[PDB]
Amino acid sequence: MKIVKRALTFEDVLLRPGYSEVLPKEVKIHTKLTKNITLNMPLISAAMDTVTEHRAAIMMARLGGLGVIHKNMDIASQVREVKRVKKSESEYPDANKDNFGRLRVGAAIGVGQMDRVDALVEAGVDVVVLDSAHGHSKGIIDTVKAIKAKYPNLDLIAGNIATAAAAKALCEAGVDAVKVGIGPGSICTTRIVSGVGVPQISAIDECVEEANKFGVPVIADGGIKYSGDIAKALAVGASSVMIGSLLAGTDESPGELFTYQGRQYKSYRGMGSLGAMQLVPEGIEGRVPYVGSIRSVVHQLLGGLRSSMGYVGAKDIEDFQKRAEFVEITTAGLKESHVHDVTITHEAPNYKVN
Amino acid sequence: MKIVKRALTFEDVLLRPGYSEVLPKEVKIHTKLTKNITLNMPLISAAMDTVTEHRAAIMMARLGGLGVIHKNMDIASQVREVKRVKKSEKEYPDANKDNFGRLRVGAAIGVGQMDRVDALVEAGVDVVVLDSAHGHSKGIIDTVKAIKAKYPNLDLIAGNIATAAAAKALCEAGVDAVKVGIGPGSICTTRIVSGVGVPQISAIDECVEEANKFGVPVIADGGIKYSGDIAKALAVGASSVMIGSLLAGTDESPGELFTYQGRQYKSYRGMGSLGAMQLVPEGIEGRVPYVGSIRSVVHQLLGGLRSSMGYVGAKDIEDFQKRAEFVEITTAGLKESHVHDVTITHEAPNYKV
Amino acid sequence: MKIVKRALTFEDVLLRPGYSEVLPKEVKIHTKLTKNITLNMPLISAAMDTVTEHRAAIMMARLGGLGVIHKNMDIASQVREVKRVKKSEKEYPDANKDNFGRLRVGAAIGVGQMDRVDALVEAGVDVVVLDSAHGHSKGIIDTVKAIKAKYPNLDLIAGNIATAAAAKALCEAGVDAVKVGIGPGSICTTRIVSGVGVPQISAIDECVEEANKFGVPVIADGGIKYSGDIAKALAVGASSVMIGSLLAGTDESPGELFTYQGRQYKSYRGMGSLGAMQLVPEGIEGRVPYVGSIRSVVHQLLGGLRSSMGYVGAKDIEDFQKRAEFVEITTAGLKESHVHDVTITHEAPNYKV
Amino acid sequence: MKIVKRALTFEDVLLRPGYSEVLPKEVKIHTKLTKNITLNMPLISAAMDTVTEHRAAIMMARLGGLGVIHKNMDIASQVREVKRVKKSESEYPDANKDNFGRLRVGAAIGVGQMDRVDALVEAGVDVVVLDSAHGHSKGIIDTVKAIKAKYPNLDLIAGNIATAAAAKALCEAGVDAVKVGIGPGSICTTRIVSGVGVPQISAIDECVEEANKFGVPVIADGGIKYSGDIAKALAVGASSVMIGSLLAGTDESPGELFTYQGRQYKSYRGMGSLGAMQLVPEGIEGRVPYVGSIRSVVHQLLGGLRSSMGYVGAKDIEDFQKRAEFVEITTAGLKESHVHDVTITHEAPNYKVN
Numbered sequence A, D: 001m002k003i004v005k006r007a008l009t010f011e012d013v014l015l016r017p018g019y020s021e022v023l024p025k026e027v028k029i030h031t032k033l034t035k036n037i038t039l040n041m042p043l044i045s046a047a048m049d050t051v052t053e054h055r056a057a058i059m060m061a062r063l064g065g066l067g068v069i070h071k072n073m074d075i076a077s078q079v080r081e082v083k084r085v086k087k088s089e090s091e092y093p094d095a096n097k098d099n100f101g102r103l104r105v106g107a108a109i110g111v112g113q114m115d116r117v118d119a120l121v122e123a124g125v126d127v128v129v130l131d132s133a134h135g136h137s138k139g140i141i142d143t144v145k146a147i148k149a150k151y152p153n154l155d156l157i158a159g160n161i162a163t164a165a166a167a168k169a170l171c172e173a174g175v176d177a178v179k180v181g182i183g184p185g186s187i188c189t190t191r192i193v194s195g196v197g198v199p200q201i202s203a204i205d206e207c208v209e210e211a212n213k214f215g216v217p218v219i220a221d222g223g224i225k226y227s228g229d230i231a232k233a234l235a236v237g238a239s240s241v242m243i244g245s246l247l248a249g250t251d252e253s254p255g256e257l258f259t260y261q262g263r264q265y266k267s268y269r270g271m272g273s274l275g276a277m278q279l280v281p282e283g284i285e286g287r288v289p290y291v292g293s294i295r296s297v298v299h300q301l302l303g304g305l306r307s308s309m310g311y312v313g314a315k316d317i318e319d320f321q322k323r324a325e326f327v328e329i330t331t332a333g334l335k336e337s338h339v340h341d342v343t344i345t346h347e348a349p350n351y352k353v354n
Numbered sequence B, C: 001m002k003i004v005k006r007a008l009t010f011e012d013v014l015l016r017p018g019y020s021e022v023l024p025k026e027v028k029i030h031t032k033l034t035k036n037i038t039l040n041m042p043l044i045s046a047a048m049d050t051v052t053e054h055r056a057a058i059m060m061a062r063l064g065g066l067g068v069i070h071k072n073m074d075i076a077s078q079v080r081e082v083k084r085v086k087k088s089e090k091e092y093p094d095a096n097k098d099n100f101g102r103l104r105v106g107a108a109i110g111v112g113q114m115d116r117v118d119a120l121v122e123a124g125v126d127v128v129v130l131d132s133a134h135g136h137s138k139g140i141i142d143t144v145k146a147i148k149a150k151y152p153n154l155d156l157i158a159g160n161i162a163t164a165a166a167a168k169a170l171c172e173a174g175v176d177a178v179k180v181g182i183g184p185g186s187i188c189t190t191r192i193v194s195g196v197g198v199p200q201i202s203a204i205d206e207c208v209e210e211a212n213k214f215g216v217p218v219i220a221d222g223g224i225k226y227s228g229d230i231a232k233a234l235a236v237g238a239s240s241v242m243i244g245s246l247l248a249g250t251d252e253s254p255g256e257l258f259t260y261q262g263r264q265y266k267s268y269r270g271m272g273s274l275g276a277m278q279l280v281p282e283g284i285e286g287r288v289p290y291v292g293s294i295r296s297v298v299h300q301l302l303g304g305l306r307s308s309m310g311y312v313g314a315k316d317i318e319d320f321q322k323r324a325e326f327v328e329i330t331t332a333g334l335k336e337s338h339v340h341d342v343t344i345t346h347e348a349p350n351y352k353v
């Protein structure tokens, strides 16, 4: 058998602190979404039917990031969701807006869905997210070429991928960003069901190095549990991070609150779960704790990133990537990194152990 | 001390995705059981008294695979089981059949059991599976030589082994397939009791490299918990996979269904457990959740396999093995690979925790 | 990406035994706090509002160590705490005292707090501990320069750091000790929240190699759970150890004792927790078991240290560091090192699970 | 810091099966206890007050191994325990006997206990086990030299040690066997309390290589949980294994049976536990499950060893050591080695997971 390497993920590594003349409050967190679109902060909500519809994409863009409307609905519904975001108005000085001063929004499509693309363009979507379980596939590559041919000024994101060869193929196909992540999603069983995938830190590292040669941003999609993971993903070279599970428990995410055994929850499920698809399932249907507003979640997450960048001595994301040095740690190191030998009595807003 | 390598198993590795032009529904999954016997799908039910009798064996063959009738019964009883399969009769277009249109079946034998082989050969058995806890032994090798001498056109599988040296010995003795696995079985305590074994992925890899020289296919036997493990075993170069615990919960497996504290189960035990031997055991007696029909289980398992081959861009298994690249992962990598940070509310058909 | 090393912590290593001619009762455990301040035993209580006020500080000093009064209070209050220690009065023959026979005490300060330093220096403080979550910063380094300029004979400790580069910066700025530890603290979430830190053993090792060039002692701060960790920290070359969770359960720590579900506790929280800050926290609020007096805790901890030095054959700490050889262990090695395969019925004074 | 090596213990390694012309029933398991004393099988019960008094040492020797009477009693009591074993009579054809046809027995002593040694010699003890928490110490080395000087034909065992230099010092001191094990005992907190110790497989490996140059057997003392560990310890080069926890729950071991929450137990405690010593404790006081007779325990343990040797192709222990090849495994390998993905319904006599 051919073993190419030993691959690491988030928990395997930590950033080394460096000399710093910058306070966390002073750092700038703007970043590229694609080659032609800027975010005022690096978070994107996942294209999932238990995460991102209009209320969520509105908040995400008001806070300077992006929401991506899921494709588990007919064209007319998705169009209507996009218009709701575009026509939204308010306090949000970091808002992420197009040239008309309208909140930016993204919308998911799948292979061959060219009629959906047409409608979304005419609805004034800012970015189309072309998604497959296997981005490195002929269907995806062909779809990219068709979309760039018909809409040369439409910003196009394609994924998911996990290797440098995939990033090369997509970039040469004409994408404006690649999405990295095969298997690391909280609700994902892809690696278990089919044995395929690449640990997320290594996948991002590999793809970034290739995507850089084309001036193409990488989106790190899936597997983020804590703000520290966001920092690590960015430091390794990603330009933004896509998040589902950390947002699925918010007010704005689709679905109703429910209480079960004294706790509040919302539903969260893979788009490859049996429920969502109504191919063998590559995702599960579950529940996540209720966590209040998107605003409160994003605030804790960005505060973590700001801390990290303060520790590293970085003024902006690009400086963060140039300075960042990692150390690989052991299981015992991870155990020391978490809270240990104390029982938590009041839960912190940015650290929950289940 | 002499340490020859760091040895890996299923949970230590993942397959890298590759450029694909094939959809999962389009890939071909036929394979080889032995030099001369073909499978339409690569699964074999284990030769265990809680897994394979005639009902399981019939379903496995109708679906394109194979069942091996266990040997924890007298010769006559086993002859009868084999006969029920061979006499069995669009609905099963992938049925694995012999030149007469009869379902194929295998039967297990032990060292020096030529009387059992005689009666099985007479009963129309398609393949004989020579089983020992230690396939790399004088007893096993002599039995091989004697069987091939007396029945030269009888397909012979022997095991279990875990080293290239063992593979070489068996191939030179004249086997038509080798079975790999010392200690990975769900119900197995061999490694703990005797301190002996080789993590299943490295074992398959080592033995495939040796047996390939002789044109001898390798059966990966034991340690499969998920469809993804089937894919890995095949990608590393196994030609087929033998499965126990995943099928012991099925309607067709021997034994009755029972309910305990709100959950349904069937029994499952090692053939070296106390119960099965009736003494220093190398297996345990336990229970597995009821999972309904073998059909539904096989469907999900082949689903994952096809999906894997789609991800690798492999049109068939030879191509899969050719293209397959692995990456070694850490404990944190395994944790990320499983479902994490979400509570499952509706369990999936092909993923249980 | 740039990975500079595989970094280890306490549970990754063990000390090898060596030829010994010393019994544990015979070894000497005096050490250095700073270039100019001496300790009779090497423990310092953490500068936390659930660990060190005047009661703890007095006990730590009477036993030959030191307490650092925390800074989560106004300047006046902290001046008063420091004053209660300095005014405090065979029973304590190892008492750590200044040239006037007064117990020694330290006090914590933050970046740009020269007013606090002024009032502490006036109150007779023996050492000032300059604390920041990130000691390798322009703020900390400028504060050092300003303090040493204004009070050149005032012993100054600064931290926290975890790299040789940080150690070098601080030593050149003029500190009398560096404090090492980014993220190992029991109540600390820094590593999870910001992704930043260095496993404590490698951190100490890196910083000791740098600071030693300047004659500057290293304080290992955070992550101690057992006496054995104290030994390792010292053997790697720390001159002293700062301890939080192990002392938060004591009579003398601030806060009241309470009972919850049959067990006794006191509160313990990070100075960067929400509660202590009153916002994006880097600590948590929790509880630790009540453990009785500081004396009894320190007794057990120094017991393990002396035992360690006996095992290594070290007559004193310099000798310990000289002789110490480590071995790196695996997860299975750690499991064997703990109590295993037996249920504890009467808990030990110095081992809790 | 100086890191000499990465050290492995039992769970880190497995034996490779080899070509075999031998059945488990056919293999011979006799071994050297010391340079001048043979065991018919390689097990020794631990010198502990909750393991080995006369009833236990009698059974151990009848089965061909050895019991070592603990030293937590006055001289007269220990002498009387030794005589009880020596005067025992019975069915036990593998019995381990001196030249007078009396069951062999060993007795523990500590540094300087020369009067106890005299009494034990006069009681007809076969081997004296000189024990310290730190065998590589001047007190121990001096005691060895004094005992060999006064009783040149008395077989003398000394420990505990964990390094090649220790084995060299003891061998040159004149011992007839060295005992290896600092920290691996089930009830031991030495490694936690003082940070000192060496993972047991590495310790045995290191000491055996040194002890061999003197023709001195190594005893592997502590950390055995399963029969597989016995095989591994022997394959690495040890001549016998000392066991406490696996025997503490037997009829013959000191102490009464008790029932707590529907289970039967016996007490088991470190000799460095607070209870036993009545220095900071380096052991705990606990309980272990009741397991019936020593005969039934030893039978399962020896059957495991016989299997192992059958797998390796070994006719006797020395052949076992020459043939044995190990492979290092991962955490996932260990997980696969144990029972997994099945719930046990009838507990096996040689495999219990708690």
Ligand SMILES: O=C(Cn1c(-c2ccccn2)nc2ccccc21)Nc1ccc2ccccc2c1
Residues within 6 Å of the ligand: A132, A133, A134, A137, A190, A271, A272, A273, A277, A279, A282, B020, B022, B023, B024, B307, B308, B310, B311
């Ligand atoms: O689409 C899924 C599973 N799946 C998912 C999903 C979503 C995110 C991550 C993983 N899987 N969503 C689905 C929706 C419908 C049907 C199948 C679905 N799996 C695969 C597997 C291999 C492929 C090879 C070439 C082309 C496409 C391939 C697709």
Ligand SMILES: O=C(Cn1c(-c2ccccn2)nc2ccccc21)Nc1ccc2ccccc2c1
Residues within 6 Å of the ligand: B132, B133, B134, B137, B190, B271, B272, B273, B277, B281, B282, D020, D022, D023, D024, D307, D308, D310, D311
């Ligand atoms: O047969 C078993 C135990 N055992 C099993 C069994 C089945 C599958 C995997 C492991 N063990 N089934 C048994 C049925 C009856 C008696 C013993 C049995 N163990 C061994 C062990 C070493 C050997 C060395 C040379 C030749 C044969 C050897 C056999």
Ligand SMILES: O=C(Cn1c(-c2ccccn2)nc2ccccc21)Nc1ccc2ccccc2c1
Residues within 6 Å of the ligand: A020, A022, A023, A024, A307, A308, A310, A311, C132, C133, C134, C137, C190, C271, C272, C273, C277, C281, C282
């Ligand atoms: O001070 C805290 C958090 N924090 C803490 C604390 C204490 C010990 C360990 C970690 N954090 N205590 C605080 C008290 C008030 C407000 C914030 C606090 N975090 C940071 C993070 C990055 C920095 C970079 C340059 C300079 C200062 C930086 C500070």
Ligand SMILES: O=C(Cn1c(-c2ccccn2)nc2ccccc21)Nc1ccc2ccccc2c1
Residues within 6 Å of the ligand: C020, C022, C023, C024, C307, C308, C310, C311, D132, D133, D134, D137, D190, D271, D272, D273, D277, D279, D282
């Ligand atoms: O004797 C014990 C602890 N201890 C034990 C024990 C028994 C087995 C394993 C570990 N410790 N039994 C004891 C009985 C009484 C007092 C202390 C005891 N610990 C030490 C530690 C370092 C030493 C250095 C030189 C000489 C002797 C040393 C002893």
Ligand SMILES: O=c1[nH]cnc2c1ncn2[C@@H]1O[C@H](COP(=O)(O)O)[C@@H](O)[C@H]1O
Residues within 6 Å of the ligand: A046, A047, A048, A160, A181, A183, A184, A185, A186, A187, A188, A189, A190, A221, A222, A223, A224, A242, A243, A244, A245, A246, A269, A270, A271, A272, A273, A282, A283, A284
């Ligand atoms: O069902 C699925 N199977 C596998 N991955 C999925 C599925 N549905 C969504 N995803 C991915 O998982 C991500 C969410 O990851 P999370 O932030 O870790 O919960 C999404 O952005 C998708 O990339």
Ligand SMILES: O=c1[nH]cnc2c1ncn2[C@@H]1O[C@H](COP(=O)(O)O)[C@@H](O)[C@H]1O
Residues within 6 Å of the ligand: B046, B047, B048, B160, B181, B183, B184, B185, B186, B187, B188, B189, B190, B221, B222, B223, B224, B242, B243, B244, B245, B246, B269, B270, B271, B272, B273, B282, B283, B284
């Ligand atoms: O009692 C036993 N001890 C060791 N291996 C066994 C025993 N019984 C069956 N096996 C092996 O384990 C396999 C079943 O593995 P499973 O698929 O992991 O449950 C069988 O096909 C045999 O190779």
Ligand SMILES: O=c1[nH]cnc2c1ncn2[C@@H]1O[C@H](COP(=O)(O)O)[C@@H](O)[C@H]1O
Residues within 6 Å of the ligand: C046, C047, C048, C160, C181, C183, C184, C185, C186, C187, C188, C189, C190, C221, C222, C223, C224, C242, C243, C244, C245, C246, C269, C270, C271, C272, C273, C282, C283, C284
């Ligand atoms: O809230 C916090 N976040 C991170 N580190 C902290 C915090 N509060 C105290 N510390 C550090 O952690 C140490 C206590 O570590 P402990 O001995 O493991 O409990 C203190 O001495 C500080 O160095």
Ligand SMILES: O=c1[nH]cnc2c1ncn2[C@@H]1O[C@H](COP(=O)(O)O)[C@@H](O)[C@H]1O
Residues within 6 Å of the ligand: D046, D047, D048, D160, D181, D183, D184, D185, D186, D187, D188, D189, D190, D221, D222, D223, D224, D242, D243, D244, D245, D246, D269, D270, D271, D272, D273, D282, D283, D284
């Ligand atoms: O209290 C103690 N502390 C550390 N080791 C001990 C103590 N008492 C006995 N031992 C050792 O532990 C062994 C028992 O190991 P076990 O077979 O793993 O339970 C004994 O043979 C001694 O070598």
Ligand SMILES: [Cl-]
Residues within 6 Å of the ligand: A017, A018, A019, C165
């Ligand atoms: Cl730096």
Ligand SMILES: [Cl-]
Residues within 6 Å of the ligand: B165, D017, D018, D019
């Ligand atoms: Cl061989």
Ligand SMILES: [Cl-]
Residues within 6 Å of the ligand: A331, B331, C331, D331
């Ligand atoms: Cl691990």
